[model samples]
Target: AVPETRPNHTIYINNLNEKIKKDELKKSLYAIFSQFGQILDILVSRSLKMRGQAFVIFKEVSSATNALRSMQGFPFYDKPMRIQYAKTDSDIIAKMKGTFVERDRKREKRKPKSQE
Candidate 1:
């Protein structure tokens, strides 16, 4: 059998309440995970097919490992959150690092209608 490999700096989280708003969920997750280390990026799926799942990427593998161990079974919105190493390759994570900066710039460009 082939041995399983996972990303060093990425974590897979699930068991979220579908009713939770994306922005709220992001803020909530950030608050909890940031305590472990600097977060590189976070992705929350809103699609019905992929709802209640999130991916958190950390700047360091040590941080990711710490968060995974400390946060497993942590309660969130009445559900015990599941935390595990994300099954991904370093190549994909490298691509995402560049994408995250671009994405952040795009988000910043979208100013509020009233402020514009």
Candidate 2:
């Protein structure tokens, strides 16, 4: 199971083989999640240079929570899976905006005058 300290909407899995294919990953994730409810989408990272990692999106938050509660500590492909709520692109962008605001505040403090 993913650590509770990890963000509430993100899952992280380790020990996945590099050879695992996209279709296989989707099928496995769907199978587990479908038992809880319906799946909305599956987003896997596409950096060819990287190894196995995936992000699963469910139609409902309850379904995702159920999946995590039921299958998080279970073995998948011979490795213990790490499951939790998965974050979306919009969430990441929002967090970045907050970070930018703080960074800009610091930059302004170091500036002699406002540029605009």
Candidate 3:
């Protein structure tokens, strides 16, 4: 699935400590590699299914490269961090590139919830 992505503006990371809360985990990371570049978003899902992982989205691809190179294997909390190029662009990036379509919650059209 990562095919054709090449070096990009989003980086996926794992090997995170699950005990840490999402806000601190997200915010703590924001202040770290964030020093190297301007970040657009930081993904943090507290769900058990996707715990111990995150995605860091940057304003530019070059910035993503810098963070990945500088932070790879850098120990955080209880373990070393693993950084890799994300499989695809973030929603924001795809939207900006004209490649994104908002996913519908249902296959059929929604009933009108009229607003005055």
Candidate 4:
């Protein structure tokens, strides 16, 4: 049987530069989420050609929710990074997959689009 599928349930990170390193990005995300609860992991999306964003997964759903509700529209690194729970695993997967796929997509190309 296939592995059980989990909903995406990812938090969106915005105003991030592609040049930000994983440790630095994770530290930033952890700092924000840590205010509300513990973070299980953080996934930042990057490209060979452009800047990237991040997805943070928390151990507790409530913590994630709290972080989401509180962090939205808040400033970090001089820019407000959007935060919310993703609706489905596929959504997160697709977003992450985009990081690996064609590098010319609108996001990778630095085209303006919705934060999430």
For candidate 2, write residues 1-116 as lDDT tens digits: 74563333334344456677667877787787776756555555434533465655566666666667767767887776767455552343334333335332321235677898
**C-alpha RMSD for every candidate:** 5.3, 11.8, 8.4, 12.6
Worst 10 residues of 1 by lDDT: 98-107
TM-score of each: 0.70, 0.60, 0.69, 0.61
- For candidate 1, lDDT tens digit of each residue in 1-116? 74553447877777888797578776777888787776757667666654767777787877777667777778887898777777652444334343434332322335557663
Model 2 ranges with Cα > 4 A deviation: 1-12, 46-50, 89-116
Clashes of each: 0, 3, 0, 5
Candidate 2 C-alpha error for residue 93, in Å: 12
Q: For candidate 4, lDDT tens digit of each residue in 16-72?
A: 755576678888788778767767666665654324566777776667666777766
lDDT of 3 at 31: 85
In model 4, pairs of residues that clash are 7-89, 8-88, 8-89, 10-86, 18-51
Question: How good is model 4 by TM-score?
Answer: 0.61
Better of 1 and 3 by lDDT: 3
lDDT tens digits, residues 1-116, model 3?
Answer: 43633457888777787787677777867887777676767776655655767778887887777667787778787788777777664653343433346654523455779678
Candidate number that wins on lDDT, 2 or 3: 3
Q: TM-score of predicted model 1?
A: 0.70
